Design a protein around this ligand. Structure first.
Ligand SMILES: [Mn+2]
Ligand SMILES: [Mn+2]
Ligand code: NA
Length: 356
DNA sequence: AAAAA
């Protein structure tokens, strides 16, 4: 019996139901744009459960016993079985507001508010936005436009590994005992991604040394002429606060970067300007919270949402990227690994490549 | 506001 929770399912990259889930993901995205959080959630949960199936749905009978499949979702599945297409997802793909929001938010530094503003000004193309002489752009948007083609081009695994080497080389220069882990999609086994994420932690660094590492590493890259964009968010981490109930950024020190990746550093089968702009996120966390941060940054987004929902509604536990708190025992639960977090929650361990 | 798993 398939659980309603993604954290009680194994979801691997062999998706047998992409015809259904691509349509459900488009409908979910449109509901996000139309500020319909409820309908967004229903389509996300339906898409998520179908992603876990070990077989493709080929008739409506195949949906029997599957949770999170309401009447609206079942009408969409039925329509796709009928002629291989979703008329509902096709109408969203042709909607002018949806097309504009996808296109405008594809720019690094452009979110829902700026995309809405430009749409209501009558803009429909990125060429017309970039060349406009009255528009004013943030430093993030300037970098988003300057390196647009490289950033919309997926990072592959040889590129992610080349970035990992750069990160590790820079980090150990200032903290030789530091542990650097590639998180996000690549840790879940993905062949491609929009960016490369890392978690950095040090067993012996002080509170100040921990604070200074991201500044030292980015200044080093700035000197090397590799830092194309850099934004460091200082930590707001509280050692003794209860975990968050919010469904939001973690409080660890982090940085959102664009690095210059020289082609010579990439060891691929295919080995222009001779370099590629790469989005890189670095997160620094205290050593004792490394398992919670790793679990939160590994994802997927839906796996994280269900993990936190399961902890709260089924175990009366409060989980986030910094800690795990037991409301019944009135104690924080410690973990040195992700396995220990799953064991505290009463969950079978789900491998990172099973969290997709 | 937007940058995130
Ligand atoms: Mn990522
Ligand atoms: Mn990222
Ligand atoms: Na964006």
């Amino acid at each position: 019996k398939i659980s309603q929770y993604a954290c009680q399912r194994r979801t691997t990259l062999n998706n047998y139901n992409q015809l259904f889930t691509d349509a459900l993901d488009i409908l979910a995205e449109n509901d996000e744009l139309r500020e319909n959080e409820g309908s967004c959630l229903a389509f996300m949960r339906a898409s998520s459960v179908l992603k876990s199936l070990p077989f493709p749905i080929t008739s409506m009978k195949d949906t029997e016993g599957i949770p999170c499949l309401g009447d609206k979702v079942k009408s969409i599945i039925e329509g796709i079985i009928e002629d291989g297409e979703s008329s509902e997802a096709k109408a969203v793909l042709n909607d002018e507001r949806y097309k504009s929001f996808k296109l405008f938010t594809s720019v690094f530094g452009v979110g829902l508010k700026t995309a809405e503003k430009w749409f209501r000004m009558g803009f429909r193309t990125l060429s017309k936005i970039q060349s406009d002489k009255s528009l004013r752009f943030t430093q993030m948007q300037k970098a988003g436009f300057l390196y647009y083609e490289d950033l919309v081009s997926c990072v592959n695994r040889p590129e992610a590994e080349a970035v990992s080497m750069l990160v590790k080389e820079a980090v150990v220069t200032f903290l030789p005992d530091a542990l650097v882990t590639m998180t996000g999609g690549f840790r879940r086994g993905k062949m491609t991604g929009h960016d490369v994420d890392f978690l950095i932690t040090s067993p012996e660094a002080t509170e100040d040394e921990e604070q200074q590492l991201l500044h030292k590493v980015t200044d080093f890259w700035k000197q090397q002429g590799l830092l194309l964009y850099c934004d460091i968010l200082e930590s707001t981490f509280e050692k003794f606060k209860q975990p968050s109930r919010k469904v939001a950024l973690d409080h660890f020190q982090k940085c959102f970067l664009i690095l210059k990746l020289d082609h010579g550093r990439v060891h691929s089968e295919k080995s222009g300007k001779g370099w590629k702009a790469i989005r890189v996120d670095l997160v620094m966390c205290p050593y004792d919270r490394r398992a919670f941060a790793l679990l939160g940054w590994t994802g997927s987004r839906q796996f994280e949402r269900d993990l936190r929902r399961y902890a709260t509604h089924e175990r009366k536990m409060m989980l986030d990227n910094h800690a795990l708190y037991d409301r019944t025992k009135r104690v924080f639960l410690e973990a040195e690994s992700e396995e220990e977090i799953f064991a505290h929650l009463g969950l079978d361990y789900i491998e990172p490549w099973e969290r997709n």
